[PDB]
Design an enzyme around this catalytic site. Structure first.
Site, PDB file in Angstrom:
ATOM      1  N   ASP A 137       0.875  -1.197   0.174  1.00  7.46           N
ATOM      2  CA  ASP A 137       0.127  -0.189  -0.128  1.00  7.46           C
ATOM      3  C   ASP A 137       0.835   1.103   0.066  1.00  7.46           C
ATOM      4  O   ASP A 137       1.926   1.107   0.269  1.00  7.46           O
ATOM      5  CB  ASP A 137      -1.025  -0.019   1.314  1.00  7.46           C
TER       6      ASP A 137
ATOM      7  N   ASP B 121       0.252   4.065   2.120  1.00  5.87           N
ATOM      8  CA  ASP B 121      -0.059   4.442   3.412  1.00  5.87           C
ATOM      9  C   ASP B 121      -1.427   5.376   3.216  1.00  5.87           C
ATOM     10  O   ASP B 121      -2.159   5.075   2.697  1.00  5.87           O
ATOM     11  CB  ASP B 121       1.027   5.411   4.157  1.00  5.87           C
TER      12      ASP B 121
HETATM   13  C1  LIG Z   1      -2.331  -6.840   8.071  1.00  7.85           C
HETATM   14  S1  LIG Z   1      -2.469  -5.060   8.127  1.00  7.85           S
HETATM   15  C2  LIG Z   1      -1.611  -4.813   9.285  1.00  7.85           C
HETATM   16  C3  LIG Z   1       0.164  -5.079   9.195  1.00  7.85           C
HETATM   17  O1  LIG Z   1       0.416  -4.068   8.205  1.00  7.85           O
HETATM   18  C4  LIG Z   1       1.683  -3.895   8.088  1.00  7.85           C
HETATM   19  N1  LIG Z   1       1.848  -2.584   7.206  1.00  7.85           N
HETATM   20  C5  LIG Z   1       1.374  -2.613   5.975  1.00  7.85           C
HETATM   21  N2  LIG Z   1       1.350  -1.273   5.414  1.00  7.85           N
HETATM   22  C6  LIG Z   1       1.343  -0.470   6.619  1.00  7.85           C
HETATM   23  C7  LIG Z   1       1.402   0.998   6.610  1.00  7.85           C
HETATM   24  N3  LIG Z   1       0.945   1.952   5.816  1.00  7.85           N
HETATM   25  N4  LIG Z   1       1.722   1.490   8.028  1.00  7.85           N
HETATM   26  C8  LIG Z   1       1.958   0.490   9.082  1.00  7.85           C
HETATM   27  N5  LIG Z   1       2.283  -0.631   8.991  1.00  7.85           N
HETATM   28  C9  LIG Z   1       1.753  -1.115   7.700  1.00  7.85           C
HETATM   29  C10 LIG Z   1       2.019  -3.708   9.491  1.00  7.85           C
HETATM   30  O2  LIG Z   1       3.426  -4.121   9.940  1.00  7.85           O
HETATM   31  C11 LIG Z   1       0.906  -4.518  10.239  1.00  7.85           C
HETATM   32  O3  LIG Z   1       1.378  -5.999  10.830  1.00  7.85           O
END
Ligand SMILES: CSC[C@H]1O[C@@H](n2cnc3c(N)ncnc32)[C@H](O)[C@@H]1O
Ligand SMILES: CSC[C@H]1O[C@@H](n2cnc3c(N)ncnc32)[C@H](O)[C@@H]1O
Ligand SMILES: CSC[C@H]1O[C@@H](n2cnc3c(N)ncnc32)[C@H](O)[C@@H]1O
Lengths: 273, 273, 273
Positions: C217, C219
């Site tokens: 993604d 963010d």
């Molecule tokens: C399954 S959704 C949660 C996981 O997304 C991961 N992650 C993915 N994208 C992000 C993001 N934009 N910000 C923070 N953690 C993220 C993290 O390490 C967390 O364990």
């Protein structure tokens, strides 16, 4: 409240950091146990005389450097010093430098800090029902800062007269990316692990607290990054200069801090609700 | 789950901050105990009527300002409001200003935050086995923000319509070096100690939460730095204006938040794995 | 110390993140219980063979993604891998991107991190009486980083060869104001929640640890902010590419990390006092 032996009092407290486990400087030493509501301080407090002034020495890491920054009982340490009657607290600390001109071997007397700790569990003595929010705009005691600077000058040592200390959690040292943030984004000057919450608690206890920092390393910026062995070796190499400063300053602390130059000396008057 | 007395329900929750320990505004008040899995909320919840709308009032610091920011049971507070059936939550908070034009006495309705807390112990309700990661890009409820702005305008008060709140740990106030970071590096507008994790938990509970902040001070930037006594005096001086806004807004909350203007109203649909 | 069944050993550890709950890749699997002084690891460790190399697989979130980042027993996890004899640890993680050119579906092999966690409770194995301060200027194992990059190149996948990971506390995602800080002020590249204190502990245990991150993604920066469902869907969609990289890399790890390309392999020599 209770001390063993009973009746012991002191006027100046010295909190020793890396490399400073024994007083060296106190005559007629007595080891004292001081009860605290928070359990054991880092070690026995050693109380003795320096040129007619009663001094309490506490090694924050314990004898033998047994207690890392995150595991120190900061509340017990400051409570114990307060209980003995101290008015002045000199902290001696090892720090890293984030600037070329603050060199290993130089002293720094910081005037500001930035708290980047996370895991110290208690950042105050006041958890209710009296809510206390002390002002720490100018967090160190200016009276004591100026005396430290003066002593250093008189003895011929380099003493930088200002500095922002960034306090990190540890126990690991900074990554390169972190260190770039501290230096280039926060514009901090020196870095260590032990100032917070020690300073917070000192202020809440209405003590005149200042830090005499010794630069031991350049963090991640020299061709070799900092290691624990290097920090310790540099402090032990220079501890004699730190001792000579303490012997010079302490006799001049026979009196009381000047209120107008002690931001925390009456901190509770406007802080408690 | 269980309440004493039984059967009590409310539609709007008001969480009062510094200076706001009693409802003032609710008719026919009943003090309610609400069971939570996390133990005691800050105090009894007071439930009563405002122009036909049922309101639950909770002072986050307890009556008498007995509970500092770091010691508040945020989970119990939000759980209790949810249990009573509330859909809207108005938080009233004292904040410092990091900009000249956000002056003491002005209201702010923030739209963003930066979390610089460290010691709040629980930042979520979800510790497993259902893992929940709520989106908080737009963390406040826009429907309620717009209603607060409107009320302020109608009553003739200054209400700044946006702002980034930096939440610090406390209970000590910022050093000058910290405050320069919040203002000049993070470009935050206002500063307080209580928003996090209150807002996180509100979002996870699918509530429409917004903050009505009152500027009480300029942090470290005026010729006198902030003190706790000043904050309290300024809030108590202005609490009447805060009450007049609540009386204006609450009758307009008889219905439900608009989903398209409530980022957290369906937060769990895409957040749970 | 004690394992059930007894006598089990492994050479390579794989810690699986979001979307990676089962090995897939190991032949002849055995589920192992490994005693730790810190209680239960996230789940059973699965030990088996990949082309003659013994591999230990641990899902950091447990089977079924039962354990969120803040609730993981990081100490037990790393202790358990060390106890089995592993020398290499590949972490596979989902991350967000803070830059346009690090796109969903791309791999990243980061070289730096910034720790913005707060609530992980233990950031080290060493609480005294031996104080340990490891150097983490270059926190990842370069030998393993280079092998991951090579495998990705050989298979034809996009692998960004550097990156700063900002580790946030969660479980909520960042606000827009926070994300602007990570991107524009800290100049970080990717964001996640699980790296710290996992990496700290790996370094203290003298393991060669590296992260293979997959961008899931952007963010808060795309027209739709990140959600948990999106992260999971993207990882599960791409897990096959992650598996193909592991199958390629693991046979090449039959030997030992090169000391000169393993910053933590002898970390304790200069770190302990
Ligand atoms: C399954 S959704 C949660 C996981 O997304 C991961 N992650 C993915 N994208 C992000 C993001 N934009 N910000 C923070 N953690 C993220 C993290 O390490 C967390 O364990
Ligand atoms: C004995 S090595 C550990 C001590 O080094 C001090 N210190 C010295 N240099 C640094 C540095 N570069 N970063 C952080 N702490 C440091 C810390 O306060 C800690 O207690
Ligand atoms: C009653 S004084 C303490 C309260 O002041 C609020 N507050 C007001 N001004 C500031 C400020 N400058 N910095 C931080 N918190 C502040 C905090 O949220 C806290 O609960």
């Amino acid at each position: 409240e209770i001390t063993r032996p009973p009746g012991v009092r002191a006027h100046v407290g010295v909190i020793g950091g890396s490399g400073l486990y024994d007083p060296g400087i106190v005559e007629n030493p007595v080891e004292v146990k001081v009860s605290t509501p928070y359990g054991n301080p880092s070690d026995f407090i050693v109380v003795g005389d320096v040129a007619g002034v009663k001094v309490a020495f506490l090694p924050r890491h314990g004898r033998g450097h047994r207690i890392p920054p995150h595991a120190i009982n900061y509340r017990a340490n400051i409570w114990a010093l307060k209980a003995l009657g101290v008015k002045w607290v000199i902290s001696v600390s090892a720090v890293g430098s984030l600037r070329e001109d603050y060199r290993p071997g130089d002293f720094v007397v910081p005037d500001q800090f930035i708290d980047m700790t996370k895991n110290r569990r208690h950042y105050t003595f006041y958890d209710g029902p009296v809510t206390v929010h002390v002002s720490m705009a100018d967090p160190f005691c200016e009276d004591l800062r100026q005396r430290l600077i003066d002593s250093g000058r008189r003895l011929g040592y380099t003493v930088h007269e200002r500095g922002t200390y960034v306090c990190i959690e540890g126990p690991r040292f900074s990554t390169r990316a972190e260190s770039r943030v501290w230096k280039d984004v926060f514009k901090a000057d020196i870095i260590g692990m032990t100032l917070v919450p020690e300073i917070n608690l000192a202020c809440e206890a209405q003590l005149c607290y200042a830090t005499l920092a010794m630069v031991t390393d350049y963090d991640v910026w020299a061709d070799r990054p900092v290691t624990a062995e290097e920090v310790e070796r540099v402090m032990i190499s220079n501890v004699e200069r730190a001792r000579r400063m303490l012997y010079d300053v302490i006799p001049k602390l026979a009196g009381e801090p000047e209120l107008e130059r002690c931001s925390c000396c009456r901190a509770l008057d406007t802080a408690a609700i």
